[PDB]
Amino acid sequence: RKKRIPYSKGQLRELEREYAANKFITKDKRRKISAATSLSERQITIWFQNRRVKEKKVLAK
DNA sequence: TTGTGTTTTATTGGGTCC
DNA sequence: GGACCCAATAAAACACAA
């Protein structure tokens, strides 16, 4: 039960930018986002997974 | 400024790939 | 084959009606 740490503005900007380019992260873009954000590749994957739940939820209104 | 519904991280679990 | 996906869920933090 180790507790969540919200992502900074600069971190979210990199994630959002890449998401807008492709909803599904690739291995190489995951590596590069990790370098650019200091988030682990796992965190990034989880973020994309999470981000598609959000889009799904917001279309549905 | 505050209460609390909403949103954001993070885990767990089932399915495909197979 | 762990690596992907997505759904249900919890807890921390946020957003914004009062």
Nearest Cα residue to A29 out of A14, A10, A13: A14
* A25 φ/ψ angles, rounded to the nearest 5 degrees: -70, 145
CATH code at A1-61: 1.10.10.60
Q: Which nucleotide is nearest to A46 (CA to C1')?
A: B10
Q: Indicate which technique resolved this structure.
A: X-ray
CB-contacted nucleotides of strand B (7 Å): 8-11
* A6 φ/ψ angles, rounded to the nearest 5 degrees: -60, 150
How far are the Cα atoms of A6, A26, A40, A59 from residue A21, in angstroms, in the given order?
A: 23, 11, 20, 18
Dihedral sign for Cα A47, A4, A12, A41, please. negative
Q: Distance from CA of residue A44 to its chain's centroid?
A: 5
Angstrom resolution of this structure: 2.2
How far are the Cα atoms of A26, A50, A57, A59, A61 from residue A8, in angstroms, in the given order?
A: 22, 16, 23, 25, 27
- Please give residues of chain A from 29 to 58 whose alpha-adjacent beta carbon (CB) lies under 7 Å from any atom of strand C: 45, 48-49, 52-53, 56
Neighbours of A7 (CB within 10 A): 15
Domain residue limits, chain A = 1-61
